Amino acid sequence: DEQLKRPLRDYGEALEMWSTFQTKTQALSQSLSSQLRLILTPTQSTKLSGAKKIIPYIASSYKRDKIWMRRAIPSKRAYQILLCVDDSSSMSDDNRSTAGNLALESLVMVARALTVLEAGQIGVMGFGTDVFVAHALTDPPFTSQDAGARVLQQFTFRQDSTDMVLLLRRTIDHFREARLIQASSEDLWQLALILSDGLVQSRDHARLRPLLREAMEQRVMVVFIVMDDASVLELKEARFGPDGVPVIHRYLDSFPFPYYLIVHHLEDLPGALAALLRTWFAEVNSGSH
């Protein structure tokens, strides 16, 4: 907490960032939210049992189908997503890497998609040497521009190291805290989405294993998104829409084990987050297991 007295970004600047990223990602946020709504909607087909054709008059009103929808998505299941963003200087790289910005832009895309969807809670954590909650799961969803500015303010990408072990334990802790709350008024699905740049040497994989093992016993699912790009001003201009990758086939196949999605091109970052989220929502939702 004492290390947290870093200076924040200028509010006007963070406000303009949020607004710019929202405009740049709105198409993808809207598409993704319509895909997640479809995934959560009961859509199982009818089934055959046992063993002139009658042609009944089958009619309904579109009005009535919107009413069925208002009751259709069950509130017994909630989704909790912690989006964890590397707050170290490796993300800034003296403006050379540009990864920090693309990561915040992806955060905006996800936050807007979950808000429009009106299902799930979003939380945001930053991590480097310390770990801070930039936006708690119990905070109001990102409908207001102030709430978006305030999250982006907290990310300046100047911590000097990345301590993945600490991030994992706090993430586990925060999810445990969240499970206790719902035990006293509720099926709860929890996902940590961890974005960072650089390399992973397997010296890194191994020391994460006990915590990841602990997370799995607590049904927490963990996905690492690893950015490693080897220009900057047209990223500024870039507009994001659907890129044609609905799911991560390999992650679907490994569910619910921890997964590393390696993203070599930063303009794929928002696409890759969208695809991971669709995959996860599809998996936690299927009656499987």
Numbering used by the authors: 4693 to 4743, 4753 to 4886, 4891 to 4935, 4942 to 5000
Provide the authors' original text about this structure.
One of these energy-consuming enzymes is the conserved huge AAA+-type ATPase Rea1 (also known as Mdn1), which is composed of a hexameric AAA+-ATPase domain, followed by a long tail consisting of an α-helical linker region, a flexible aspartate/glutamate (D/E)-rich domain and a C-terminal metal-ion-dependent adhesion site (MIDAS) homologous to the inserted (I) domain within the α-subunits (αI) of integrins that mediate ligand recognition. In this study, we report crystal structures of the Chaetomium thermophilum (Ct) Rea1-MIDAS, both alone and in complex with its pre-ribosomal substrates, the CtYtm1- or CtRsa4-UBL domains. Besides displaying the typical MIDAS fold known for integrins, the CtRea1-MIDAS crystal structures reveal evolutionary conserved Rea1 specific structural elements.
However, due to the low yield and solubility of this construct, we switched to the thermostable Rea1-MIDAS from C. thermophilum (Ct). This construct (CtRea1-MIDAS) carries a ~105 residue-long N-terminal extension, which is absent from integrin MIDAS domains but is known to contribute to Ytm1 and Rsa4 binding both in yeast and human. However, the CtRea1-MIDAS contains three additional conserved structural elements (termed elements I, II and III) that are not present in integrin-MIDAS domains. Although this part of the N-terminal extension (amino acids 4693–4732) has a low-sequence conservation, it contains an invariant tryptophan residue in the first part of the helix (W4710 in C. thermophilum and W4633 in S. cerevisiae), which packs between helices α3 and α4 and most likely anchors the N-terminal helix in place. The second Rea1-specific MIDAS element (II, termed loop) forms a 45 amino-acid-long disordered loop (amino acids 4733–4777) opposite the critical DxSxS motif. The third MIDAS element (III) is located in the C-terminal region preceding the last α-helix of the classical α/β Rossmann fold. Rigid body fitting of the CtRea1-MIDAS into the density map of S. pombe Rea1 unambiguously identified the Rea1-MIDAS loop attached to the Rea1-AAA+ inner pore ring.
